[PDB]
Amino acid sequence: LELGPGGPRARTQRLLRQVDAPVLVAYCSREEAEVLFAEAAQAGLVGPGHVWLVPNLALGSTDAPPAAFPVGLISVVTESWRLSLRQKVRDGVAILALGAHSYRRQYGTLPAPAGDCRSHPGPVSPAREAFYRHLLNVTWEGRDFSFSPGGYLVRPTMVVIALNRHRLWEMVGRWDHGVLYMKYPVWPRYSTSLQPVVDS
Amino acid sequence: LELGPGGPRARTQRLLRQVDAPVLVAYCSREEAEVLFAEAAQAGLVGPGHVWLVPNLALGSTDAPPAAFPVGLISVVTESWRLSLRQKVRDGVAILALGAHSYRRQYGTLPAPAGDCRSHPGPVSPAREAFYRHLLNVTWEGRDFSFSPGGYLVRPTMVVIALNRHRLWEMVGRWDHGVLYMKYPVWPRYSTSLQPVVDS
Amino acid sequence: KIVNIGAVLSTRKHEQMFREAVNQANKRHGSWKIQLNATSVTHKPNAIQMALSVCEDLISSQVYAILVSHPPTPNDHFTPTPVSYTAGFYRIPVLGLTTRMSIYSDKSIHLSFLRTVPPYSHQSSVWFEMMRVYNWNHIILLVSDDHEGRAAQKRLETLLEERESKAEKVLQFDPGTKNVTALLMEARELEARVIILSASEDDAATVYRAAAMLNMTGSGYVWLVGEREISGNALRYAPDGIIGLQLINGKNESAHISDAVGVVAQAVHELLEKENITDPPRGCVGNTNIWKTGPLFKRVLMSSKYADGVTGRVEFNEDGDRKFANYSIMNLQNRKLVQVGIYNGTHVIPNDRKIIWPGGETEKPRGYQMSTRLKIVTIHQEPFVYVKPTMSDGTCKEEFTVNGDPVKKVICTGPNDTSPGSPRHTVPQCCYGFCIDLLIKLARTMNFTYEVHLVADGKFGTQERVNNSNKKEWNGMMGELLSGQADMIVAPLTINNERAQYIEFSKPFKYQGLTILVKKERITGINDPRLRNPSDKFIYATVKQSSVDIYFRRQVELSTMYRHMEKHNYESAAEAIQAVRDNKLHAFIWDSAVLEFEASQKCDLVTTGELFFRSGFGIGMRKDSPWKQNVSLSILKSHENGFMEDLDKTWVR
Ligand SMILES: *[C@@H]1O[C@H](CO)[C@@H](O[C@@H]2O[C@H](CO)[C@@H](O[C@H]3O[C@H](CO)[C@@H](O)[C@H](O)[C@@H]3O)[C@H](O)[C@H]2NC(C)=O)[C@H](O)[C@H]1NC(C)=O
Ligand SMILES: *[C@@H]1O[C@H](CO)[C@@H](O[C@@H]2O[C@H](CO)[C@@H](O[C@H]3O[C@H](CO)[C@@H](O)[C@H](O)[C@@H]3O)[C@H](O)[C@H]2NC(C)=O)[C@H](O)[C@H]1NC(C)=O
Ligand SMILES: *[C@@H]1O[C@H](CO)[C@@H](O[C@@H]2O[C@H](CO)[C@@H](O)[C@H](O)[C@H]2NC(C)=O)[C@H](O)[C@H]1NC(C)=O
Ligand SMILES: *[C@@H]1O[C@H](CO)[C@@H](O[C@@H]2O[C@H](CO)[C@@H](O)[C@H](O)[C@H]2NC(C)=O)[C@H](O)[C@H]1NC(C)=O
Ligand SMILES: *[C@@H]1O[C@H](CO)[C@@H](O[C@@H]2O[C@H](CO)[C@@H](O)[C@H](O)[C@H]2NC(C)=O)[C@H](O)[C@H]1NC(C)=O
Ligand SMILES: *[C@@H]1O[C@H](CO)[C@@H](O[C@@H]2O[C@H](CO)[C@@H](O)[C@H](O)[C@H]2NC(C)=O)[C@H](O)[C@H]1NC(C)=O
Ligand SMILES: *[C@@H]1O[C@H](CO)[C@@H](O[C@@H]2O[C@H](CO)[C@@H](O)[C@H](O)[C@H]2NC(C)=O)[C@H](O)[C@H]1NC(C)=O
Ligand SMILES: *[C@@H]1O[C@H](CO)[C@@H](O[C@@H]2O[C@H](CO)[C@@H](O)[C@H](O)[C@H]2NC(C)=O)[C@H](O)[C@H]1NC(C)=O
Ligand SMILES: *[C@@H]1O[C@H](CO)[C@@H](O)[C@H](O)[C@H]1NC(C)=O
Ligand SMILES: *[C@@H]1O[C@H](CO)[C@@H](O)[C@H](O)[C@H]1NC(C)=O
Ligand SMILES: *[C@@H]1O[C@H](CO)[C@@H](O)[C@H](O)[C@H]1NC(C)=O
Ligand SMILES: *[C@@H]1O[C@H](CO)[C@@H](O)[C@H](O)[C@H]1NC(C)=O
């Protein structure tokens, strides 16, 4: 589809009028998500019988979701989604401190500090490359912060959240050690879009 | 679309860029047809992956097709499209003569001449209505000129014409009775000017 | 309405050419009150200071687009990146004039980036064209492990998927590493003779010297490279006869400046005709929002056909890369880069001179070197491949037919008995039968020698997913042929859709189907009520990991029968036949030919029902095998005259 400010609103409504599926997986940014959900509601694609799953990109500011987001929308975040900014800062500083601790314990010296915005050395020093290696694999307070070679997290505890009746993002499932734990034996469909009735 | 002379062009250009159909059926007058085909060329709906079909109204004098008309434009005309003015006048006079001849053969006298503008013959005067009925069903030179009660040609021999590479209205198919007989068992498609690209 | 354009150039005289080009564009496109202004800055050594100067000199003004060139000193992707970030924050399009890296075509990183010169990845496409011109199918891909090499490999593989072909293998070597000879050794063991290299100049020189030391530059080999590997230190060590290619303009800064200014001017005029154009941020500091028109400006810029350029038509593809570029094919003849063709975007046309292939040959070399020694895997099937112990002196016992003719036998190497009692050595045994005689005739006709061995695990082959695996893999003979342990399968291997996707099959040398064997004729095929209503009273099964298992697994209607069979499947055909005769198994579902031969020879058993899956046995080879056509033609000729009938009379009456 094509979303965005104003844009060509046509040809997205036409396409959204030929979507016959019980489960829909959408990929868009926050504003594009709001536009898409307004268009889908105009096209009768919300309510029971339709399940939407989106990644974190569509969500923004989990504390307050938009009014266009349907209830029962499913997303997957990391465990730190509910943590405060202070707790996130503490966790990051802890990661750095534990990496420095491991590096010092294995090498016998504190890691060398960074450089400046001046002329850059070029080839990466062995000390910088070793500190990075010790900084990757770090475990802290049970949960591990192992980092991929690509720079993101490998094997984190993931939380499947969904929007309830009260328009609040609430936890529904957990993903630890490759095993799903869902709190609902059957997926609830308590949306109140039964104005056409046939929509369900 | 408005398709008016010298007016809103961005409004129609916006919608013409959203069309995804491979076959397009249009209905407009000649001037609106030229405007529409110009805008469609601007929107890239004229290439080898688009077929346009229009009724007789869209085209005008088939002897000189305009430059905006794309190649492969399909229309359906009557069998007298290639006849000269003298031949068509002869056919019309023949229809009138055959109607009068049938009326005389049944009633033993020629039909009465028409009235005048300085009067209003309120009654239908069934002598007139009988002549009209005889004028309806007429056959001439093996061609059926049977007229509908709506005063237009019914079950006529129609031909399907198209605009070829040389920008001429070439005859493609025939509508003898209720059966289609057309050349080109596969529809030929040209890349704009030349190069008759073949479907992969 | 004044429109301001910015540029980051190198020599400060290129700035003068940029100003002249903007004047020409401002006169050609009616000035009125559009006033295309031009401002420029020079590249700076420190990247951070370069980005800060981009903010202070160009973004500070109401710049609509930024052009960026490349300094003569080679620094690769280092120099155009800072601009692409700073202008990318506000969605201000930045056009690279001479950058070639593929990282700038990733719109997730470099958001508002366009280029007037294609990346190195597009050098794959022209390579593909040559593969169509000279009909090269088996190729080796030697790509560096850096992101550029991965992009080239991905582009070439995507092109090949449309043709529905594959590379023989891909060899990724770490950039800047010496002694890659080990990897080259693998390329020597393959049957393909075409090598397509994608690496930097120093890596190209290293690979060239290593291949020279390993005699990979001799006759029959073909080297296809890009411009990075035929310039600088790579050109000096490049082996004679390699084929590289160069972009026509490439390093012409002035032509690209003029073309970019033309396209920018056209796009700017179109955009101002579009209304609702807002205004650039005017300064990095303070402004923390994107330019609203930015995405629309980029969309207009991409959909532009400036067919008046110095470097030809200027058009962009879906990610801003210059579409339809011109390449010149170069051949290294006597240490000189002679031009032997031109790739005009869609085809390669040879114009002058003669192509000298690496071995000095004057004729097109084939892209394969089919060997004569053939390692043939086979299985023990009673009427087709009898396997017997050899005598104490290591040779097969002389034996004559009932008709009175000698029986041809071969020496196979197989695992003695089942795994536990085996001494775990490939003992030599004697193999003979229908398939062995077919193989002997085929080898005589096609002029190749062979060595025969038995399959290690005694399974025909199927796809299975072991737990905690990233993918499924074939076992048995199929796995042996795919992995490279074997070159050709000469056995009663059934032809089906699942195997044909990964394996080339010859024309069938025997037509047959599936049937059921029972003791002492009370089953009406697989439509019998007892077959579709399983119970502990009636037990039936087939051989594990065979064509019958694949056939039963893929049918939803036969799912319950598939479960019942899987609960009691057997290890080999002989074991299941013995179990049926020993009243342990009630019905055995297997091939028509084997089961019919067993019923006829052994008696006491009968086949029931009609054939419910008709197929044939075929010689299995690796995909796109060069001699698949020859094997098929030989089998067809053998069918035609008398050979298959003679084999049928001799072995399975
Ligand atoms: C990049 O390409 C430019 C055009 O493709 C090219 O500019 C051209 O430069 C040549 C001389 O190198 C000019 O030709 C001049 O001399 C010839 C021979 O007497 C005359 O016939 C011409 O009138 C002219 O005086 C071209 O006029 C000029 N063309 C254009 C459009 O600029 C650059 O030199 C190239 N830059 C490189 C290769 O680094
Ligand atoms: C499949 O069978 C084909 C026909 O037997 C065979 O083609 C033949 O290939 C040989 C090459 O080995 C050609 O011989 C020519 O080339 C050699 C080497 O270049 C020269 O020394 C010879 O003098 C001769 O000029 C045959 O001409 C050719 N036969 C035909 C009819 O084209 C294929 O090679 C076989 N496929 C394989 C073996 O994979
Ligand atoms: C985190 O990863 C680093 C990097 O592998 C580990 O550091 C290694 O420690 C072992 C001793 O246990 C040394 O033999 C290696 O040479 C070290 N690697 C490097 C690159 O220096 C570190 O041990 C890991 N942390 C934990 C808690 O396991
Ligand atoms: C054309 O239609 C007219 C009108 O139906 C036909 O005229 C009729 O002919 C029948 C035949 O004897 C007469 O019984 C009717 O009285 C006529 N009606 C009128 C109104 O004239 C005429 O025959 C038809 N012509 C042909 C060739 O079928
Ligand atoms: C038109 O472009 C010229 C550059 O040629 C701009 O002049 C520059 O202005 C900046 C800031 O005022 C100065 O730092 C430069 O030194 C000037 N360059 C030269 C060569 O004088 C001018 O500002 C632009 N005009 C508009 C209206 O954008
Ligand atoms: C680079 O790799 C090559 C190939 O692996 C090395 O050459 C081998 O080195 C081993 C010693 O480990 C010896 O068996 C021989 O010298 C070589 N064997 C073969 C089969 O080639 C080489 O030593 C490596 N290092 C270099 C060239 O500096
Ligand atoms: C590749 O180079 C060829 C010339 O060898 C270009 O072909 C000419 O292009 C110019 C530029 O518009 C035309 O005026 C000529 O008529 C073309 N000649 C022929 C025979 O086609 C070609 O345009 C270049 N490639 C691209 C993509 O521009
Ligand atoms: C069958 O194969 C053998 C060896 O593979 C061929 O013997 C030699 O093949 C090479 C290959 O070109 C020739 O140059 C030699 O001249 C051959 N030797 C002799 C003595 O002629 C043999 O020619 C092949 N038989 C064919 C092709 O019919
Ligand atoms: C490469 O060819 C030369 C040529 O005589 C030879 O001496 C050398 O042994 C060859 N290298 C091999 C076979 O690895
Ligand atoms: C242009 O902008 C005005 C005000 O921002 C808006 O009302 C109008 O709809 C826009 N025109 C478009 C989006 O075509
Ligand atoms: C092969 O296995 C048999 C067991 O039946 C054994 O008698 C024989 O010695 C073995 N051959 C060897 C070990 O070479
Ligand atoms: C997964 O595979 C391993 C491989 O040996 C095996 O040990 C393990 O039991 C398997 N886990 C299962 C079947 O749950």
From Swiss-Prot, chains A, B:
Q: Please tell me in which tissues this protein is expressed.
A: Detected in cerebellum.
Tell me the superkingdom of the source: Eukaryota
Q: Where in the cell is it found?
A: Cell membrane; Postsynaptic cell membrane
Glycosylation is annotated at: N137
Which residue spans adopt a coiled-coil conformation according to this UniProt entry?
none
What does the similarity note say? Belongs to the glutamate-gated ion channel (TC 1.A.10.1) family. NR2C/GRIN2C subfamily.
Tell me how this protein assembles.
Answer: Heterotetramer. Forms heterotetrameric channels composed of two GluN1/zeta subunits (GRIN1), and two identical GluN2/epsilon subunits (GRIN2A, GRIN2B, GRIN2C or GRIN2D) or GluN3 subunits (GRIN3A or GRIN3B) (in vitro). In vivo, the subunit composition may depend on the expression levels of the different subunits. Interacts with PDZ domains of PATJ and DLG4. Interacts (via PDZ-binding motif) with SNX27 (via PDZ domain); the interaction is required for recycling to the plasma membrane when endocytosed and prevent degradation in lysosomes.
So what does this one do?
Component of N-methyl-D-aspartate (NMDA) receptors (NMDARs) that function as heterotetrameric, ligand-gated cation channels with high calcium permeability and voltage-dependent block by Mg(2+). Participates in synaptic plasticity for learning and memory formation by contributing to the slow phase of excitatory postsynaptic current and long-term synaptic potentiation. Channel activation requires binding of the neurotransmitter L-glutamate to the GluN2 subunit, glycine or D-serine binding to the GluN1 subunit, plus membrane depolarization to eliminate channel inhibition by Mg(2+).
Can you quote the domain comment? A hydrophobic region that gives rise to the prediction of a transmembrane span does not cross the membrane, but is part of a discontinuously helical region that dips into the membrane and is probably part of the pore and of the selectivity filter.
The name on file for this protein is Glutamate receptor ionotropic, NMDA 2C
Species name: Rattus norvegicus (Rat)
Gene for this chain: Grin2c
Curated annotation (Swiss-Prot), chain C:
Q: Where does glycine bind?
A: P492, T494, R499, S547, D591
Q: What activity regulation does UniProt give? A: NMDA glutamate receptor activity is potentiated by Zn2(+) in a dose-dependent fashion. The potentiating effect of Zn2(+) is at submicromolar concentrations and its inhibitory action is at high micromolar to millimolar concentrations. Excitatory glycine receptors are inhibited by D-serine at 100uM.
The record places the following residue ranges in the Extracellular compartment, namely: 1-520, 521-653
**Alphabetical keyword list:** Calcium, Cell membrane, Disulfide bond, Glycoprotein, Ion channel, Ion transport, Ligand-gated ion channel, Magnesium, Membrane, Metal-binding, Phosphoprotein, Postsynaptic cell membrane, Receptor, Signal, Synapse, Transmembrane, Transmembrane helix, Transport, Zinc
Keyword Transferase on entry? no
Q: Name one GO biological process term.
A: associative learning
Cellular component GO terms, alphabetical = cell surface; cytoplasm; dendrite; dendrite membrane; dendritic branch; dendritic spine; endoplasmic reticulum; endoplasmic reticulum membrane
- Can you quote the domain comment? A hydrophobic region that gives rise to the prediction of a transmembrane span does not cross the membrane, but is part of a discontinuously helical region that dips into the membrane and is probably part of the pore and of the selectivity filter.
On subunit structure and binding partners, the annotation says:
Heterotetramer; the NMDAR subunits are modular and harbor tiered domains that function in concert to regulate opening and closing of the cation-selective ion channel pore. Forms heterotetrameric channels composed of two GluN1/zeta subunits (GRIN1), and two identical GluN2/epsilon subunits (GRIN2A, GRIN2B, GRIN2C or GRIN2D) or GluN3 subunits (GRIN3A or GRIN3B) (in vitro). Can also form heterotetrameric channels that contain at least two GluN1 subunits and at least two different GluN2 subunits (or a combination of one GluN2 and one GluN3 subunits) (in vitro).
Family note: Belongs to the glutamate-gated ion channel (TC 1.A.10.1) family. NR1/GRIN1 subfamily.
Q: What is this protein called?
A: Glutamate receptor ionotropic, NMDA 1
Q: Which gene encodes it?
A: Grin1
Q: Which residues of the full protein are shown?
A: 25 to 794 of 938
